[PDB]
Amino acid sequence: LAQRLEGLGGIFDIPQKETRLKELERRLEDPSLWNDPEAARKVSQEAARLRRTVDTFRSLESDLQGLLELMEELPAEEREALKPELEEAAKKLDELYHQTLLNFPHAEKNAILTIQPGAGGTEACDWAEMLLRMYTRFAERQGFQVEVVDLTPGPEAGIDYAQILVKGENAYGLLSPEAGVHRLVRPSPFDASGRRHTSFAGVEVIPEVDEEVEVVLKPEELRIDVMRASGPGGQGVNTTDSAVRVVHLPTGITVTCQTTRSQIKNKELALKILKARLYELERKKREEELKALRGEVRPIEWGSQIRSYVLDKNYVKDHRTGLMRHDPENVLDGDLMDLIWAGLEWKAGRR
Template sequence: MFDKLDDLLARYEEIMNELNEPTVTNNQDRFRKLMKEQSDLTPIVEAYKEYKKCKQDEEDSLALLDSESDEDMKEMLKEELSAAKKRIEELEKELKILLLPKDPNDDKNVIMEIRAGAGGDEAALFAAEMYRLYVHYAESQRWKTELLNVDEIGIGGMKEVSFTITGQGAYSKLKYESGVHRVQRVPETESGGRIHTSTVSVAVMPEVDDDIDIVIDDKDIRIDVMRASGNGGQCVNTTDSAVRLTHYPTGIVVYSQTEKSQLQNKAKAFALLKAKLYDLEQQQRHDAEAEMRRSQIGTGDRSEKIRTYNFPQGRVTDHRIGLTLYKLDKIMNGDIGEIIDGCILADQTAKLARMNQEG
């Protein structure tokens, strides 16, 4: 581990030297790559420098302790030694986590898709509430959301909704939301007061940017334009602005109707299709690496029931990490940070355990 840390420290110093050269700003691509690498290395380098300082403090305290005869000074040196040792242990754990292989998609924006599952209108109502949950969570992170497509039902529910979330590290947190979310409550339409169980499925896909090569052949795709349906604003329902793409090889169909312009809807539809094709490619890779998929939280099986929202008891349970919280109202308003932090910790623990087995 320390050989690797020394190499990273040397690389960090190389980058800093190169960034200080006046000519580097003339090549914007090179400058951006160096800045990105420097940003990625900074937390590791800072932790490692602190670790080395603590190790030096430990050695200094031990040397002074051997030569010191004053009891008060000895006591003070023992306290300093104990504090250094404690911090060294903490930093070793921190460095192991920082050295875990990084998901290349973590810094990407995301496209989310929520679909009503079992439960009819009640599932569609819950899908709309889940959409609001993620919009509120995005706002709390200072991320931007943009609607791609929505299929609404008359009572305020959504059969399906897809939208983008743009912001630093969006995928690194939201990837843990992929899977089936289950709600248990008495529907407003239920006169007998019986608790119903409904489900919605959430898919979280990294947005495909220029560094990912997804080729869509013209002959593999059909583009249909039509009049938008549902609750549209002025002009939206009066022109053929909605766009539907059908991808023949995979059978994937995407639809975009939120913009007034056919061109804008087409661009959004292609962005969604690219994300779906990349996601499909990732799923197939994870299926081929079954052990890796099992040890990861939130990037595996889309049909897995990951969370239950029980309204009568006011509780939310994440089944993957065994976490139950009795603050359903806050969670439905976007307060999901504690659940996401729990998933990140469980994911890191599983990866560390696997790394230790391999090591």
């Protein structure tokens, strides 16, 4: 299959677009439309990378009969001058594949992940907090920083809403195939009869883009509110603390943010998120469009849960990818990579 990566890694169409990014950049009247010349050198990496693909499969296929020398002799002065080029290769292969699985759009950008319970009652709020812990642990073990933009606790337990900002390379991309509905099956700690409950929570992920590509906001298009959760009776120093709710009147889109103390840094974040949600509202719409042009029915949508975590029977099962894991306790503690790559491939495989 890594043989067929060169299959949909496009290597017959890509060897022709390379000698193109250069010609448009050769004419002196290129920087006339500035927004095109800046993405012709960046896209020209794909011009040089393909040779880096054949050059690596030739270097790789050395191994197809390279260790023939070492399996015939063990010391190797000349051969170990080629093997340290194989780990730059063995690890250049994974890279390639995982590199190609990550190039969409904004795959590179940080991520804004949001969780809200669905049906199930108290069970669903606990489940939502569980997913939050899962993604927080996921970030943790990946070297990403997490900024709890907001976190609304639930009536009786768990959370009623949560929204985080995961900062790190390809946060969006990696987390992107996780957007969807998640189903939980197990007996509820909240119900005395050991009756299995079924609970749901949905997860969203959009990317935190570059604000330059984002619209600009009219102060008169917003309604800033400074909120103080709700202190039980004691509202003396609780009359003005630090959380701000920005509303975007034209849409009704709203963003709340209690990350820090400085009420002024929070407005900044609330607005950084808000901007990105509008940006998302656009793309979503700019795509409901190409359907107008030869798109009369339903595209490709998955209604029920994308993944199931059924604990009393000890397995986690991704219904799209098909990947089944027997250690839900690990999945639930952050170990998500294998579920992700698989999702990325399932998503790629359909573009």
